[PDB]
Design an enzyme around this catalytic site. Structure first.
Site, PDB file in Angstrom:
ATOM      1  CE  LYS A   1       3.441   9.651   3.514  1.00  0.00           C
ATOM      2  NZ  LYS A   1       3.143   9.797   4.957  1.00  0.00           N
TER       3      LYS A   1
ATOM      4  CG  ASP B   1       6.977   4.693   5.429  1.00  0.00           C
ATOM      5  OD1 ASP B   1       6.031   5.002   6.189  1.00  0.00           O
ATOM      6  OD2 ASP B   1       7.540   3.574   5.439  1.00  0.00           O
ATOM      7  CB  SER B   2      11.256   3.721   6.902  1.00  0.00           C
ATOM      8  OG  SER B   2      10.707   2.435   7.099  1.00  0.00           O
ATOM      9  N   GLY B   3      10.870   1.910   4.459  1.00  0.00           N
ATOM     10  CA  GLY B   3      11.197   0.745   3.660  1.00  0.00           C
ATOM     11  C   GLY B   3      12.132  -0.262   4.302  1.00  0.00           C
ATOM     12  CG  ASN B   4      13.694   0.566   7.981  1.00  0.00           C
ATOM     13  OD1 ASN B   4      13.666   1.070   9.104  1.00  0.00           O
ATOM     14  ND2 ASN B   4      14.091   1.235   6.904  1.00  0.00           N
ATOM     15  CB  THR B   5       9.089  -3.792   7.215  1.00  0.00           C
ATOM     16  OG1 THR B   5       9.098  -3.312   8.566  1.00  0.00           O
ATOM     17  CG2 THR B   5       8.331  -5.106   7.150  1.00  0.00           C
ATOM     18  CG  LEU B   6       9.220  -3.452   0.653  1.00  0.00           C
ATOM     19  CD1 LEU B   6       8.119  -4.503   0.699  1.00  0.00           C
ATOM     20  CD2 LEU B   6       8.749  -2.215  -0.080  1.00  0.00           C
TER      21      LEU B   6
ATOM     22  CG  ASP C   1      -0.201  -0.205   2.523  1.00  0.00           C
ATOM     23  OD1 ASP C   1       0.949  -0.701   2.502  1.00  0.00           O
ATOM     24  OD2 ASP C   1      -0.790   0.115   3.578  1.00  0.00           O
TER      25      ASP C   1
END
Ligand SMILES: [Mg+2]
Ligand SMILES: [Mg+2]
Ligand SMILES: [Mg+2]
Ligand SMILES: [Mg+2]
Lengths: 169, 168, 169, 168
Positions: free
Chosen positions: C123, C95-100, C92
């Site tokens: 973002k 943003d930070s994109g760590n988890t991803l 969805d």
């Protein structure tokens, strides 16, 4: 924080008492003729489980499941089916007994031949939910306990005896 | 394995019918005043859920859980449902055993209310009497795929309900 | 608390853009000849997933998994095997994109034919981990957004458009 | 199905050997100064874990996780292992595929260190070269049960390693 841990229930006493529970549980289910399964509640009961199942002289299966501990959820469910089987929920300690109480309900919905609970430690003074506990190793006062699967600040969970935490001033 | 898939319930009809269910569910809970949460059963209901919740005109939360002879909980809810109106959302109900047990499990949590809303219903295949409060379509026992329903890991993404035609 | 929600990206625009992404993804994988599977990250992507997979004109399977969001854990894993298959992670918003980032690593360990990510919202200004995002619906400023699977105080997750939360004084 | 079970590795030997492993592991991590955590793989290692952690003389935490062609995580760790010494604890290693992948998954979390300690090892059945740092017993490819290892949902609770004897 800042504390000490002293022996409350030595390893030998725990071993002895477990051997006893072992006999009791065996005597109780030896003639059922139905499949049996001890269900432990992770993380706390891995050690008590390991020792208790070795004292149970009836062919059974060992399984675990973990519940949240305000709604009670199933974080990890059983691998075994318990329908029509004798089930013995195995726990390290019971105090308030809310979670235990709900886990028992959930499982009964699966229609097992029978459902019982066996706990190593019991703090009757802390109960909040009336729940039937069929086997108890030790009834203890509301002491700050650690060991045998019970931890404190991610420590002592591996101690072979029940210890008392002493909070130094 | 060798087969064909033909349209059984076109996309437009499904959308329309869902808008209707939407109204029904809204009318039914609009004055509850309690928190509401639609609970979908993965994998099957991800699409019906996505569309149904957009038609529900009452502030709610959306959650999922997945269930497995004994009926087990492979993935539980993230939300607490105690004292809340809960609407279990499913793609299709046939035998209804699993659904039946999931309903029991949840009631143990003491929600304000419990209901089920399914896109498809195959009354002729019921094995467990279970209360289904909202239904999109009552259909004959047809080999169906689409809208979350798959077959050999296929068709789950079709925007319409299709009928599988085995080829001999 | 105490706020309002106004339309930021209307439903029609989102639908249109998704149809486009749909075409792009189809064009990109139409000739792979390998099994494909879109993997959504619960809870947030259930709606974007539902709409995006209907626009993808190639036979695929749809699956989900949920990760913790300091260590990244797998709360619910895939049902499908992705080895040798084209995998499209569907989110969805990034943003930070760590988890991803970590989820992507975990999955690659399974040796899929290919791995890509498609997010509805992006973002860029909030990135903390350089992670390859192959498909984006909208690049947006760091706005307080809700809707289309994105919630706030267990609300708005079901809105059919992307909304902006306005914190009233 | 028709069989018999005879003692392969008696309980006493197992206890003794575990006490030894205990010393080895302690000697090895006693001076790390970092948090330590033994990670067991359910169901098989619940008993070996229970006994091994009592022999480890360094303050650690005990955790479990369960893994499933693709290797999936059915239940993940509760603890974070980043920057910590991690010891994966298993009942037995043979092919070692699953173990191999679980090790990879965990390393992605960047622990201070990663090692494996197994009660039993069947070197002759390896299919994936995987580093095993501690072993209780290296055994031939025998039909074994007990200490967490089952057969037809039986013997998992035996206090010794037994050999299954098929009857013809
Ligand atoms: Mg307990
Ligand atoms: Mg369904
Ligand atoms: Mg997301
Ligand atoms: Mg093992």
């Amino acid at each position: 924080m800042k504390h000490t841990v002293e022996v409350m229930i030595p390893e030998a006493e725990i071993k002895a008492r477990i051997a006893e529970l072992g006999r009791q549980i065996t005597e109780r289910y030896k003639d059922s003729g139905s499949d049996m399964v001890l269900v432990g509640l992770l993380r706390g009961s891995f050690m008590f489980m390991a020792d208790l199942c070795r004292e149970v002289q009836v062919s059974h299966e060992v399984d675990f499941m973990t519940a949240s501990s305000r709604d009670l959820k199933i974080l990890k469910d059983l691998d075994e089916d318990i329908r029509g089987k004798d089930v013995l929920i195995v726990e390290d300690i019971i105090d308030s007994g809310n979670t235990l109480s709900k886990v028992r309900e959930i499982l009964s919905l699966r229609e097992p031949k029978s459902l019982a609970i066996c706990t190593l430690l019991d703090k009757p003074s802390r109960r909040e939910v009336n729940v039937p506990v069929e086997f108890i190793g030790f009834s203890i006062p509301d002491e700050f306990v650690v060991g045998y699967g019970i931890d404190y600040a991610q420590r002592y969970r591996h101690l072979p005896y029940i210890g008392k935490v002493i909070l130094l001033d």
